[PDB]
């Protein structure tokens, strides 16, 4: 959990936090810990059209899980979304060998939000 990523979470207004909070609750649907785990990840990813395995699911969480928690909480959840945005938005550093996982974090949110097709006002974009 980098300070920059942490700041990004706090940089979110009440509406922004509320919107993400809703996704978090859904993400951890049935979660005993309340954090996004492999079980929750698999279900969420399944909706996105993915079929990752438990080992793969844990790896994903590990991507945003810097504390070695093993699960993605509210902090990691926002960080994961911010991480992707920060990349295209900035993409500073960029280690060698290139980066993998072209999965769109925004795309996942759309699946999680659902809304019977009409996910939020289309005018918002
Ligand atoms: N531009 C960097 C993209 C990284 C952000 C997304 N990472 S991801 O492995 O594709 C991913 C997608 C959806 C849910 C995830 C969760 Cl819940 C945890 C870790 C990674 C996840
Ligand atoms: Ca954690």
PDB file of C-alpha atoms and ligand atoms in Angstrom:
ATOM      1  CA  UNK A   1       0.000   0.000   0.000  1.00  0.00           C
ATOM      2  CA  UNK A   2       2.012   2.945  -1.319  1.00  0.00           C
ATOM      3  CA  UNK A   3       1.408   6.410   0.122  1.00  0.00           C
ATOM      4  CA  UNK A   4       0.433   7.610  -3.335  1.00  0.00           C
ATOM      5  CA  UNK A   5      -2.212   4.900  -3.691  1.00  0.00           C
ATOM      6  CA  UNK A   6      -3.442   5.595  -0.166  1.00  0.00           C
ATOM      7  CA  UNK A   7      -3.772   9.275  -1.015  1.00  0.00           C
ATOM      8  CA  UNK A   8      -5.747   8.369  -4.129  1.00  0.00           C
ATOM      9  CA  UNK A   9      -8.313   6.622  -1.962  1.00  0.00           C
ATOM     10  CA  UNK A  10      -8.644   9.649   0.326  1.00  0.00           C
ATOM     11  CA  UNK A  11      -8.732  11.883  -2.747  1.00  0.00           C
ATOM     12  CA  UNK A  12     -12.106  10.318  -3.537  1.00  0.00           C
ATOM     13  CA  UNK A  13     -15.045  12.518  -2.542  1.00  0.00           C
ATOM     14  CA  UNK A  14     -18.004  11.253  -0.514  1.00  0.00           C
ATOM     15  CA  UNK A  15     -19.877  10.233  -3.655  1.00  0.00           C
ATOM     16  CA  UNK A  16     -16.763   8.528  -5.037  1.00  0.00           C
ATOM     17  CA  UNK A  17     -16.156   6.657  -1.787  1.00  0.00           C
ATOM     18  CA  UNK A  18     -19.831   5.737  -1.558  1.00  0.00           C
ATOM     19  CA  UNK A  19     -19.805   4.377  -5.109  1.00  0.00           C
ATOM     20  CA  UNK A  20     -16.719   2.274  -4.428  1.00  0.00           C
ATOM     21  CA  UNK A  21     -18.046   1.219  -1.032  1.00  0.00           C
ATOM     22  CA  UNK A  22     -21.064  -0.301  -2.761  1.00  0.00           C
ATOM     23  CA  UNK A  23     -18.793  -2.322  -5.047  1.00  0.00           C
ATOM     24  CA  UNK A  24     -16.765  -3.459  -2.038  1.00  0.00           C
ATOM     25  CA  UNK A  25     -19.850  -4.790  -0.277  1.00  0.00           C
ATOM     26  CA  UNK A  26     -20.908  -6.704  -3.387  1.00  0.00           C
ATOM     27  CA  UNK A  27     -17.345  -7.880  -3.995  1.00  0.00           C
ATOM     28  CA  UNK A  28     -17.170  -9.395  -0.519  1.00  0.00           C
ATOM     29  CA  UNK A  29     -20.648 -10.897  -0.887  1.00  0.00           C
ATOM     30  CA  UNK A  30     -20.761 -13.822   1.533  1.00  0.00           C
ATOM     31  CA  UNK A  31     -17.208 -13.028   2.645  1.00  0.00           C
ATOM     32  CA  UNK A  32     -16.671 -13.934   6.293  1.00  0.00           C
ATOM     33  CA  UNK A  33     -13.794 -11.470   6.610  1.00  0.00           C
ATOM     34  CA  UNK A  34     -15.614  -8.862   4.528  1.00  0.00           C
ATOM     35  CA  UNK A  35     -12.637  -8.515   2.188  1.00  0.00           C
ATOM     36  CA  UNK A  36     -12.337  -9.612  -1.442  1.00  0.00           C
ATOM     37  CA  UNK A  37     -10.849 -13.105  -1.373  1.00  0.00           C
ATOM     38  CA  UNK A  38     -10.240 -15.743  -4.020  1.00  0.00           C
ATOM     39  CA  UNK A  39     -13.761 -17.087  -3.541  1.00  0.00           C
ATOM     40  CA  UNK A  40     -15.240 -13.614  -3.999  1.00  0.00           C
ATOM     41  CA  UNK A  41     -12.771 -12.841  -6.764  1.00  0.00           C
ATOM     42  CA  UNK A  42     -13.737 -15.950  -8.691  1.00  0.00           C
ATOM     43  CA  UNK A  43     -17.424 -15.056  -8.516  1.00  0.00           C
ATOM     44  CA  UNK A  44     -16.787 -11.448  -9.529  1.00  0.00           C
ATOM     45  CA  UNK A  45     -14.389 -12.486 -12.278  1.00  0.00           C
ATOM     46  CA  UNK A  46     -16.896 -15.089 -13.447  1.00  0.00           C
ATOM     47  CA  UNK A  47     -19.387 -12.313 -14.044  1.00  0.00           C
ATOM     48  CA  UNK A  48     -16.776 -10.416 -16.046  1.00  0.00           C
ATOM     49  CA  UNK A  49     -16.518 -13.518 -18.241  1.00  0.00           C
ATOM     50  CA  UNK A  50     -13.395 -14.938 -16.593  1.00  0.00           C
ATOM     51  CA  UNK A  51     -12.847 -18.341 -14.999  1.00  0.00           C
ATOM     52  CA  UNK A  52      -9.684 -18.014 -12.855  1.00  0.00           C
ATOM     53  CA  UNK A  53      -8.609 -20.705 -10.389  1.00  0.00           C
ATOM     54  CA  UNK A  54      -8.107 -20.321  -6.611  1.00  0.00           C
ATOM     55  CA  UNK A  55      -4.330 -20.116  -6.999  1.00  0.00           C
ATOM     56  CA  UNK A  56      -4.791 -17.551  -9.742  1.00  0.00           C
ATOM     57  CA  UNK A  57      -7.378 -15.732  -7.639  1.00  0.00           C
ATOM     58  CA  UNK A  58      -4.939 -15.412  -4.738  1.00  0.00           C
ATOM     59  CA  UNK A  59      -2.315 -14.093  -7.144  1.00  0.00           C
ATOM     60  CA  UNK A  60      -4.652 -11.303  -8.225  1.00  0.00           C
ATOM     61  CA  UNK A  61      -5.222 -10.249  -4.625  1.00  0.00           C
ATOM     62  CA  UNK A  62      -1.469 -10.432  -4.090  1.00  0.00           C
ATOM     63  CA  UNK A  63      -1.117  -7.825  -6.839  1.00  0.00           C
ATOM     64  CA  UNK A  64      -2.962  -5.257  -4.736  1.00  0.00           C
ATOM     65  CA  UNK A  65      -2.169  -6.946  -1.434  1.00  0.00           C
ATOM     66  CA  UNK A  66       1.179  -5.434  -0.473  1.00  0.00           C
ATOM     67  CA  UNK A  67       0.694  -6.105   3.233  1.00  0.00           C
ATOM     68  CA  UNK A  68       0.686  -9.821   2.440  1.00  0.00           C
ATOM     69  CA  UNK A  69      -2.818 -10.010   3.906  1.00  0.00           C
ATOM     70  CA  UNK A  70      -3.854 -12.443   1.176  1.00  0.00           C
ATOM     71  CA  UNK A  71      -7.164 -10.654   0.645  1.00  0.00           C
ATOM     72  CA  UNK A  72      -8.254  -7.338  -0.863  1.00  0.00           C
ATOM     73  CA  UNK A  73      -9.937  -5.024   1.637  1.00  0.00           C
ATOM     74  CA  UNK A  74     -11.441  -1.579   1.146  1.00  0.00           C
ATOM     75  CA  UNK A  75      -7.932  -0.121   0.969  1.00  0.00           C
ATOM     76  CA  UNK A  76      -6.610  -2.693  -1.516  1.00  0.00           C
ATOM     77  CA  UNK A  77      -9.883  -2.628  -3.433  1.00  0.00           C
ATOM     78  CA  UNK A  78      -9.583   1.107  -4.144  1.00  0.00           C
ATOM     79  CA  UNK A  79      -5.846   0.737  -4.641  1.00  0.00           C
ATOM     80  CA  UNK A  80      -6.355  -1.931  -7.309  1.00  0.00           C
ATOM     81  CA  UNK A  81      -8.712   0.351  -9.217  1.00  0.00           C
ATOM     82  CA  UNK A  82      -6.405   3.311  -8.645  1.00  0.00           C
ATOM     83  CA  UNK A  83      -3.380   1.231  -9.640  1.00  0.00           C
ATOM     84  CA  UNK A  84      -4.810   0.601 -13.102  1.00  0.00           C
ATOM     85  CA  UNK A  85      -5.862   4.236 -13.477  1.00  0.00           C
ATOM     86  CA  UNK A  86      -2.452   5.416 -12.285  1.00  0.00           C
ATOM     87  CA  UNK A  87      -0.820   3.259 -14.941  1.00  0.00           C
ATOM     88  CA  UNK A  88      -2.513   4.772 -17.992  1.00  0.00           C
ATOM     89  CA  UNK A  89      -2.838   8.090 -16.187  1.00  0.00           C
ATOM     90  CA  UNK A  90       0.889   8.054 -15.441  1.00  0.00           C
ATOM     91  CA  UNK A  91       2.605   4.691 -15.843  1.00  0.00           C
ATOM     92  CA  UNK A  92       5.717   6.121 -14.198  1.00  0.00           C
ATOM     93  CA  UNK A  93       8.606   3.782 -13.401  1.00  0.00           C
ATOM     94  CA  UNK A  94       7.437   0.889 -15.575  1.00  0.00           C
ATOM     95  CA  UNK A  95       9.792  -1.997 -14.806  1.00  0.00           C
ATOM     96  CA  UNK A  96      11.486  -4.017 -17.593  1.00  0.00           C
ATOM     97  CA  UNK A  97      10.031  -7.112 -19.242  1.00  0.00           C
ATOM     98  CA  UNK A  98       6.791  -5.185 -19.738  1.00  0.00           C
ATOM     99  CA  UNK A  99       3.652  -5.499 -17.608  1.00  0.00           C
ATOM    100  CA  UNK A 100       1.009  -8.213 -17.884  1.00  0.00           C
ATOM    101  CA  UNK A 101      -2.685  -8.534 -17.046  1.00  0.00           C
ATOM    102  CA  UNK A 102      -4.516  -6.266 -19.478  1.00  0.00           C
ATOM    103  CA  UNK A 103      -7.700  -6.774 -17.474  1.00  0.00           C
ATOM    104  CA  UNK A 104      -9.666  -3.530 -17.232  1.00  0.00           C
ATOM    105  CA  UNK A 105     -10.485  -2.638 -13.655  1.00  0.00           C
ATOM    106  CA  UNK A 106     -13.212  -0.298 -14.887  1.00  0.00           C
ATOM    107  CA  UNK A 107     -14.715  -3.160 -16.895  1.00  0.00           C
ATOM    108  CA  UNK A 108     -14.958  -5.266 -13.740  1.00  0.00           C
ATOM    109  CA  UNK A 109     -16.748  -2.459 -11.919  1.00  0.00           C
ATOM    110  CA  UNK A 110     -19.353  -2.333 -14.663  1.00  0.00           C
ATOM    111  CA  UNK A 111     -20.010  -6.048 -14.211  1.00  0.00           C
ATOM    112  CA  UNK A 112     -20.151  -5.669 -10.434  1.00  0.00           C
ATOM    113  CA  UNK A 113     -22.443  -2.638 -10.635  1.00  0.00           C
ATOM    114  CA  UNK A 114     -24.691  -4.320 -13.182  1.00  0.00           C
ATOM    115  CA  UNK A 115     -27.923  -2.333 -12.982  1.00  0.00           C
ATOM    116  CA  UNK A 116     -29.760  -4.571 -15.438  1.00  0.00           C
ATOM    117  CA  UNK A 117     -27.726  -3.350 -18.411  1.00  0.00           C
ATOM    118  CA  UNK A 118     -28.234   0.358 -17.778  1.00  0.00           C
ATOM    119  CA  UNK A 119     -25.254   0.719 -15.451  1.00  0.00           C
ATOM    120  CA  UNK A 120     -25.668   4.251 -14.118  1.00  0.00           C
ATOM    121  CA  UNK A 121     -26.717   7.213 -16.249  1.00  0.00           C
ATOM    122  CA  UNK A 122     -25.211   6.774 -19.713  1.00  0.00           C
ATOM    123  CA  UNK A 123     -24.805  10.548 -19.808  1.00  0.00           C
ATOM    124  CA  UNK A 124     -22.111  10.199 -17.143  1.00  0.00           C
ATOM    125  CA  UNK A 125     -20.060   8.045 -19.519  1.00  0.00           C
TER     126      UNK A 125
HETATM  127  N1  LIG B   1      -3.226  -1.554 -15.181  1.00  0.00           N
HETATM  128  C1  LIG B   1      -3.001  -2.513 -14.093  1.00  0.00           C
HETATM  129  C2  LIG B   1      -4.223  -3.403 -13.892  1.00  0.00           C
HETATM  130  C3  LIG B   1      -4.200  -3.999 -12.483  1.00  0.00           C
HETATM  131  C4  LIG B   1      -5.569  -3.833 -11.822  1.00  0.00           C
HETATM  132  C5  LIG B   1      -6.407  -5.092 -12.019  1.00  0.00           C
HETATM  133  N2  LIG B   1      -5.677  -6.309 -11.583  1.00  0.00           N
HETATM  134  S1  LIG B   1      -6.497  -7.660 -12.012  1.00  0.00           S
HETATM  135  O1  LIG B   1      -5.634  -8.892 -11.727  1.00  0.00           O
HETATM  136  O2  LIG B   1      -6.828  -7.614 -13.503  1.00  0.00           O
HETATM  137  C6  LIG B   1      -7.982  -7.760 -11.064  1.00  0.00           C
HETATM  138  C7  LIG B   1      -9.198  -7.640 -11.715  1.00  0.00           C
HETATM  139  C8  LIG B   1     -10.377  -7.710 -11.002  1.00  0.00           C
HETATM  140  C9  LIG B   1     -10.350  -7.896  -9.623  1.00  0.00           C
HETATM  141  C10 LIG B   1      -9.127  -8.017  -8.938  1.00  0.00           C
HETATM  142  C11 LIG B   1      -9.058  -8.207  -7.521  1.00  0.00           C
HETATM  143 CL1  LIG B   1     -10.469  -8.309  -6.504  1.00  0.00          CL
HETATM  144  C12 LIG B   1      -7.815  -8.316  -6.906  1.00  0.00           C
HETATM  145  C13 LIG B   1      -6.658  -8.242  -7.650  1.00  0.00           C
HETATM  146  C14 LIG B   1      -6.717  -8.060  -9.017  1.00  0.00           C
HETATM  147  C15 LIG B   1      -7.942  -7.945  -9.671  1.00  0.00           C
HETATM  148 CA1  LIG B   2      -4.694  -7.001   2.730  1.00  0.00          CA
END
